[PDB]
Curated annotation (Swiss-Prot), chains A, C:
Annotated EC: 2.5.1.55
Official protein name in the record: 2-dehydro-3-deoxyphosphooctonate aldolase
Known catalytic reactions: D-arabinose 5-phosphate + phosphoenolpyruvate + H2O = 3-deoxy-alpha-D-manno-2-octulosonate-8-phosphate + phosphate
InterPro entries the record matches: Aldolase_TIM, DAHP1/KDSA, KDO8P_synthase
Record GO terms (molecular function): 3-deoxy-8-phosphooctulonate synthase activity
Assembly, per entry: Oligomer.
One cellular-component annotation, GO: cytosol
Family: Belongs to the KdsA family.
Signal peptide boundaries: none
Subcellular location(s) per record: Cytoplasm
HAMAP family linked: KDO8P_synth
Any single biological process term in GO: keto-3-deoxy-D-manno-octulosonic acid biosynthetic process
Source organism per UniProt: Aquifex aeolicus (strain VF5)
From Swiss-Prot, chains B, D:
Catalytic activity: D-arabinose 5-phosphate + phosphoenolpyruvate + H2O = 3-deoxy-alpha-D-manno-2-octulosonate-8-phosphate + phosphate
Pfam families reported in the protein's UniProt record: DAHP_synth_1 (PF00793)
Organism of this sequence: Aquifex aeolicus (strain VF5)
EC number: 2.5.1.55
GO molecular function: 3-deoxy-8-phosphooctulonate synthase activity
Compartment list: Cytoplasm
Name used for this protein in its record: 2-dehydro-3-deoxyphosphooctonate aldolase
UniProt family annotation: Belongs to the KdsA family.
Amino acid sequence: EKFLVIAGPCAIESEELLLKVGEEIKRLSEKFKEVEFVFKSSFDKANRSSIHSFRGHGLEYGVKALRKVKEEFGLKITTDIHESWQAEPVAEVADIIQIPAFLCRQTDLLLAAAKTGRAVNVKKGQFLAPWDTKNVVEKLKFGGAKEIYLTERGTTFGYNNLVVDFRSLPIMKQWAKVIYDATGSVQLPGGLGGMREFIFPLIRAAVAVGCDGVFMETHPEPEKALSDASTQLPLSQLEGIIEAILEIREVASKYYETI
Amino acid sequence: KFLVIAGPCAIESEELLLKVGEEIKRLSEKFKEVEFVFKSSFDKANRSSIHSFRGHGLEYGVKALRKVKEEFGLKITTDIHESWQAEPVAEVADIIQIPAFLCRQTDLLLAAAKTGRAVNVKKGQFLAPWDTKNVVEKLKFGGAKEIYLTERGTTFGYNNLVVDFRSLPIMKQWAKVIYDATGSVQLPGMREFIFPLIRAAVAVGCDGVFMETHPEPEKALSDASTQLPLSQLEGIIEAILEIREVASKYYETI
Amino acid sequence: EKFLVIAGPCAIESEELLLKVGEEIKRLSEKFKEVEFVFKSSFDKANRSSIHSFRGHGLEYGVKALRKVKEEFGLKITTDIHESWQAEPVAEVADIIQIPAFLCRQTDLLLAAAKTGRAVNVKKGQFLAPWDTKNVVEKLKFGGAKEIYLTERGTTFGYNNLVVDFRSLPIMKQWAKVIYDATGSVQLPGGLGGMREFIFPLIRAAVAVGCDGVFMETHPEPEKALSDASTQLPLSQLEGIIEAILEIREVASKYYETI
Amino acid sequence: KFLVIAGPCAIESEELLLKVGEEIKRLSEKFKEVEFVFKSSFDKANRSSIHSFRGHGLEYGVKALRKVKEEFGLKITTDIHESWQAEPVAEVADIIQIPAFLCRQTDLLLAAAKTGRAVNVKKGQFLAPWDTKNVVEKLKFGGAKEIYLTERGTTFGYNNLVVDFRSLPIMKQWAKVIYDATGSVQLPGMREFIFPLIRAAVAVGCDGVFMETHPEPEKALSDASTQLPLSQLEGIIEAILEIREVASKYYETI
């Protein structure tokens, strides 16, 4: 099947940042024709640790900025919702509605996303076991979702640390398409945190094990990002990472197990 | 004074609430030094299965709770799941409770603080003790003056929660600490560990305990495996007050 | 039953340090007559992280120093072994043979300790689940051990950290007397580590839950210790801690569950 | 060259060793770029139950292994459990293996290094990746020149091990890294996860893989739930060499 690459700046810092990233993603979409690209960016960081951190410019502004990206580059769009009422307005531009990791068990939010008729991607909560995602997919199907994805983004491992149990990819694959969050899985919750040096190796692991797509937050200058400055991938490195995982995926694919 | 927050997990009916409320009222009269707070949810908004009991709704719930406060003069507390629920809930709730999974949702916290009520945040199973400092700051920023942090266990491998009692003294630096005696032994539980760990909580030192109690836990529509049998509540309360009395002498300064 | 308080300097830095601690332990044994004191000290730290750290002055010297303590103060003695051949010579002075946490599954070591006829105290490995200690006790009984103790000293929780799951006390109590290691449970493995501020609260928790004794490494000046300098309890604080746990134990005891 | 350490968990008999050794010899001739090392224990010294199979002893074991090296010209490796065993084992063993639980026992490490042989330390389930640096230092201090660190999983809650692949690049800073493909999926296991994770190990980058293989794992006297069926070894080796070939291009510098 067509490999999915979900990527974009963590937060919609501005409509300019988006178009700048969208341009590069469009270029890669033209090169990697065997890949389905989806532009990602949050109109709001509703779960920052500190009340003083950047959240965003609002739903209205965010949706409008995203529609511009889709309009200008013809790229599919995905963004996350935080409360039920947001599903409807977001569904107007988002091809895939994302459910935040902490909210992966909030029934009404999942139901709100599902009835829009859009695809739904649920980030697996850091407190959730792989096999417990079966009920998550069941809620979505109950709610009308026909295209469902489960995203691996790490599991709580002691304090301020996340480990990736790759056994989750084949387990979750039993009931939904699986995406690997290459940048969220290396973050250190409330650490400062994040270790950028592990993004690449862990993503190679993901494609070797086998998944249906990767998720990466990328920014022109991660150092200046308003969110996830420690984990966002420098935009100039995106192409190389993608070529690399496509190569590893190809050679490893004949060995992927049959669920 | 020492806080004791108790009640059935879910508002299965105002009938059940009234029965439990009667017993809590009784204990309330028997333990005058303890501040009792009746607790119950009008909706289990985070059940694993779409086919599980959620409740009878916010309206039916607030009504049932209203009847408990009016018929027994007991303070009330319930949890909210989305921002718009803060205001209507604040009508009856003296303490607005924030679900563990939602302890980082800024808008939910701000909405609860805005109501002027007291706010009790259940500590996420993914959160480190010291990271609750920022949770409190959000509430203070939002106008909350009576803030509580409730220890309910931490993710330990899959389908298991461990109680790191080091959290109590750490969280006490910036907020009053409550120990969730029934939520801490559940397996994302063993009722046999409820009393032992509640004893540990008061020996370590906390500002209150939190317990889900039901006449027939096995028949409860929620947390049937961890809810405390109503008949056992008095005995446990007496026990923890006695332990607290002796142990409080050694609680570390702030 | 008579509460057990196992205490002493982590390592036998010298025979003087031992007599100095032994004197204080003897004084407390005279005061707390409802307590059975056992003087503890390792003749060798065989598992230091660094090859450059203090290990000890050898078995010969250690045993001789311990025999002096027992001889001078009439105090029971306990020390740990690291290999099978050490059981016999150590058994000549030690009333209780201790098995290190990392070695709690080494069959021959456990068997070596058991055949001496001495009591055996096994530190629960940081990798072991509470219920898995049942087989540990079975090995010891198979080997002839008649007086067996299981010591809770924490469990691996993420990297360089240990958490105490107090549910282990009643679980392990099903097949052996249980001891709580108040100083080992707060150490941060390979941290530098240890957090002394948590020793007291966690020990209050232990007696409230209910155990058959406590284990504490105490040194006149923890800051100058050759081992566990970050976790050893200042000797001057020992009396107060003991009085405190006896008080909490008493008031909580009527509520201890029946296994 | 890339290392492939394989063989039956326990030396159930030199008969079994010879059969497995024959297949490993065959692969050895088929994969000339890979350095194969025959592995097997003469004693399961850390079994949970006193009533489980331990082995036939060090003498019978060293003899059986000697026969494999002489009959197939394959390098040998086995694990020691106490210091005195280092010397006699070094007679046959090209690589002395240090059990995971014993990775911190200084004397055991020094005794293995003293023999002049190569030393492979299984990383304790309680050890952080960066703390293996000191393990290597001990071996260097002891005279070891060929040092290996084997990733075999980390304690994750109770009765479970997780493989944190971040360890591979971290440990590679001070020693060659081997991935234990069968020990990492055992539950203190699911064979279905052996191949997926071994693929991940080579995509990330390691200097070799470690696998316990047996003609009939289900009948094996040790690790019957995690041992790889002998017939599947060739296929997995071919697969990991192909993945390595493509992925090695991206392994990070040191």
